[PDB]
């Protein structure tokens, strides 16, 4: 509950509404049957074991249904991912000093130094080279996102 304990009362209320779209009988639990109904409304045709698998990913207590606390943990994890994505785009905008969509070595040097980083010139060059998948000498947004993706 450490993740869910980080949510505001307002976020909890939004998420209670989201939970209700799954928990259509209002009994406090999302079942595989309920999930299947939602997935079919999304144009999917899952199997029972697929639904069970989806439940299992969220079902911290192993009881086979999703309660509100488990739902809140899931939503808190999604919020954290959204926040991380936002931090990465905002950092890209700064590192790409001229806004042209590519981080050059010179730009990276400037930003690093202005942030008080003491990286040597070789280290800056290395950072560009490692991230530069396409070989054009600079780092585009998708290259940056890949570089910042956990392992």
């Amino acid at each position: 509950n450490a993740m869910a304990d980080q949510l505001t009362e307002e976020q909890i209320a939004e998420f209670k509404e989201a939970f209700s779209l799954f928990d259509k009988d209002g009994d406090g639990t999302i079942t595989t049957k309920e999930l299947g109904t939602v997935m079919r409304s999304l144009g999917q045709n899952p199997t029972e074991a697929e639904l069970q698998d989806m439940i299992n990913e969220v079902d911290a207590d192993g009881n086979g249904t999703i309660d509100f606390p488990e739902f809140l943990t899931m939503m808190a994890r999604k919020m954290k991912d959204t926040d991380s994505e936002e931090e990465i785009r905002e950092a890209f905008r700064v590192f790409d000093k001229d806004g042209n969509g590519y981080i050059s070595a010179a730009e990276l040097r400037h930003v690093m130094t202005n942030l008080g980083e003491k990286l040597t010139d070789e280290e800056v060059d290395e950072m560009i080279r490692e991230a530069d998948i396409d070989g054009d000498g600079q780092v585009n947004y998708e290259e940056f996102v890949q570089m910042m993706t956990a392992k």
Partner: peptide, 13 residues
């Protein structure tokens, strides 16, 4: 690695 350096800089931002 390069990722850690980029990350350390992002935390300064």
């Amino acid at each position: 690695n390069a990722q850690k350096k980029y990350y350390n800089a992002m935390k300064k931002l």
